[PDB]
Design a protein around this ligand. Sequence first.
Ligand SMILES: Nc1nc2c(ncn2[C@@H]2O[C@@H]3COP(=O)(O)O[C@H]4[C@@H](O)[C@H](n5cnc6c(=O)[nH]c(N)nc65)O[C@@H]4COP(=O)(O)O[C@H]3[C@H]2O)c(=O)[nH]1
Ligand SMILES: Nc1nc2c(ncn2[C@@H]2O[C@@H]3COP(=O)(O)O[C@H]4[C@@H](O)[C@H](n5cnc6c(=O)[nH]c(N)nc65)O[C@@H]4COP(=O)(O)O[C@H]3[C@H]2O)c(=O)[nH]1
Length: 75
Amino acid sequence: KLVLDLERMAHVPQEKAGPLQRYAATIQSQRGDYNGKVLSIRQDDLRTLAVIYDQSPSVLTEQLISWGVLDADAR
Ligand SMILES: Nc1nc2c(ncn2[C@@H]2O[C@@H]3COP(=O)(O)O[C@H]4[C@@H](O)[C@H](n5cnc6c(=O)[nH]c(N)nc65)O[C@@H]4COP(=O)(O)O[C@H]3[C@H]2O)c(=O)[nH]1
Ligand SMILES: Nc1nc2c(ncn2[C@@H]2O[C@@H]3COP(=O)(O)O[C@H]4[C@@H](O)[C@H](n5cnc6c(=O)[nH]c(N)nc65)O[C@@H]4COP(=O)(O)O[C@H]3[C@H]2O)c(=O)[nH]1
């Protein structure tokens, strides 16, 4: 399970924040979960985020865990 902590997402360094924040906003909106504090995403979404961020998926996963946005279990 890939679960994003939206509160922590507000504290990702501003240089990296935009794309992830829009991607989460859009999924949350499409689901109609406007009041949610956390957001599960598809495995395919993590691979898409790796492309957007030009990172190895392992690196991006570890980054998102270090920022507290993904849980350790995401590994
Ligand atoms: N529990 C569960 N239900 C699933 C899953 N996949 C699809 N569904 C259900 O099937 C719906 C239609 O899926 P969709 O055509 O992909 O249409 C989806 C999709 O295009 C997009 N969306 C929603 N959530 C995500 C997401 O986490 N990631 C991505 N990439 N797109 C999403 O917004 C649409 C509307 O989402 P919903 O209103 O939630 O409506 C979803 C949802 O009720 C799943 O892996 N698990
Ligand atoms: N083709 C297809 N596959 C399905 C469907 N439902 C579930 N799966 C598969 O089963 C996995 C787990 O579903 P989940 O526990 O609901 O766990 C899902 C779920 O909580 C949520 N999710 C993903 N997409 C949607 C969505 O469109 N709507 C909603 N409400 N939740 C979603 O994100 C989690 C992870 O998504 P995935 O990595 O894709 O991982 C999904 C996906 O591979 C479906 O209707 N169609």
